[PDB]
Structures are given as structure tokens and as C-alpha cells.
Amino acid sequence: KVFGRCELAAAMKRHGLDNYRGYSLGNWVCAAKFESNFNTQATNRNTDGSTDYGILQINSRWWCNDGRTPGSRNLCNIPCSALLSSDITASVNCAKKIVSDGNGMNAWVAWRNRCKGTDVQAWIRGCRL
Ligand code: NA
Fold this sequence. Notes:
Blueprint: H1 5-14, H2 25-36, E1 43-45, E2 51-53, E3 58-59, H3 89-99, H4 109-114
Antiparallel strand pairs: 1-2, 2-3
Helix pairs in contact: 1-2
Sodium ion is lined by residues 60, 64-65, 69, 72-74.
Catalytic activity: Hydrolysis of (1->4)-beta-linkages between N-acetylmuramic acid and N-acetyl-D-glucosamine residues in a peptidoglycan and between N-acetyl-D-glucosamine residues in chitodextrins
Function: Lysozymes have primarily a bacteriolytic function; those in tissues and body fluids are associated with the monocyte-macrophage system and enhance the activity of immunoagents. Has bacteriolytic activity against M.luteus.
Keywords: Allergen, Antimicrobial, Bacteriolytic enzyme, Disulfide bond, Glycosidase, Hydrolase, Secreted, Signal
């Protein structure tokens, strides 16, 4: 599924991401935009052989099991393919564990490089939220 900007914002808010660990909703929408272009089916391989999955590009090195990342962890206790669903529940619940791990949203390279320190509230402007 390719989400619209306000559609995703509304769904993230319903799932409790707005101001989760202090990150306003615009941060999460900005992160999804530059991680996946709002596409739930996005995948990208990393140099170490792990793979990033879904709208928030969650990595198989730590967070999910894809059967092809030996020596890795599965801290969200899910198969990585669950992160590609049109239903973003699994992605959001796993993202809540990531952002809680001590590094905040700095865990997402695209957030630190393209969202942090910008006007992230612009990403929800015009939405009925
Ligand atoms: Na894994």
C-alpha cells in the first residue's frame, strides 16, 4: 500500500505515535516519507547483509526474523514480512520498541539526516487530525 500523507498521519495518531517518547506526529511522517516514500512494501538491503522492511524500514539485524540474517536478533518477535502489510500495526508497535531503546529517533538514519532540526510540523499541515 502507498499511503497518502494525511492518511498515514491519521493512522499513526490512532496507533498512539503522536508525542510518543516526546516525538510529535510530524517527526514520524517525515521519517516514513524519507525511509519508504510512504510505501509499505519497501525493502532495502544493508551492507552487512541485513534488510530493512516496510514503511519505517525496520532492520532484520535486531528487530525481525527474515530467515536470511544469521546471528541476528528478533526483538519485535515478528517475521519481517509482517512489516510489509497494508495494516501498519506491526510496524508501529515495533517502532515503539525501537524509539524506546535509548537512542530515540536517531535510530532512523533518514530522520536524523533529513527531519531532525527542520520544521517537521509542516508534514501534517492541512490534515484533519
Ligand atoms: Na533478525
